Design a protein around this ligand. Sequence first.
Ligand SMILES: NS(=O)(=O)c1ccc(OP(=O)(O)c2ccccc2)cc1
Ligand SMILES: [Zn+2]
Length: 260
Amino acid sequence: MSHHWGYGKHNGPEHWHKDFPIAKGERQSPVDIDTHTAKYDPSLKPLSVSYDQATSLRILNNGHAFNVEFDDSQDKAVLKGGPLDGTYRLIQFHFHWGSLDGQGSEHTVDKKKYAAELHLVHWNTKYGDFGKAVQQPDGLAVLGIFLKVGSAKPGLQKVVDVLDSIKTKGKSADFTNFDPRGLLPESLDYWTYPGSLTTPPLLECVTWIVLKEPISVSSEQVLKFRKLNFNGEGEPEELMVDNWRPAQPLKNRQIKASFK
Ligand SMILES: NS(=O)(=O)c1ccc(OP(=O)(O)c2ccccc2)cc1
Ligand SMILES: [Zn+2]
């Protein structure tokens, strides 16, 4: 209730370390993915994305992004396999995006920035709840998917169409019966490394799984993201754009590839 961090010049990524010293830690996210330096790990398993029984509930503008929230009180939408041991439940997804099509992703690929990045957030069921899981080095698994501007993503349009109803911080809307399978690319080829939340509190609790294949979204879909507001209703309008953290030092980490 006393957090003042954001993405402005006076409260953005360069300032976060003052309230969240782990910002300068040993396993911060995002990072640049050097495709030539990532090593193929033949011991890495295919990812298992099991979203058939997903139960979406609500969409919330939290003043930093918008979250599509799921029922995570049972194994309904789970991520397993790949680098993971055990079962990770989907709790929410959100995006980071830019003011311009040439920026917006948090991870980069050979220094390339995508227009946006989708984060499907999952927590390790052996820790019982999300709040306990974020305190553990293997508490979360975030599936990251890049967005490039080209053809529309049909499975994104229900998200685009509700944004008018959650323009400002603190607004929520019913968002039942949304199928997150409609946001996945064809291939589940991925890179993986140990990292952190990319927003305060920047906890070092995430196994990152970043898909190699981007999804295409239309210019009109991402334009609607950029009409959202960071501010609350009745406050001065600040467009919700450039809500990404830049790449952080890799330090003592290796990025593993599931492919080639
Ligand atoms: N952008 S990312 O790395 O996917 C992320 C960031 C923060 C997240 O949790 P959060 O919902 O901000 C939270 C953290 C700690 C206590 C309560 C809530 C989840 C994913
Ligand atoms: Zn995120």
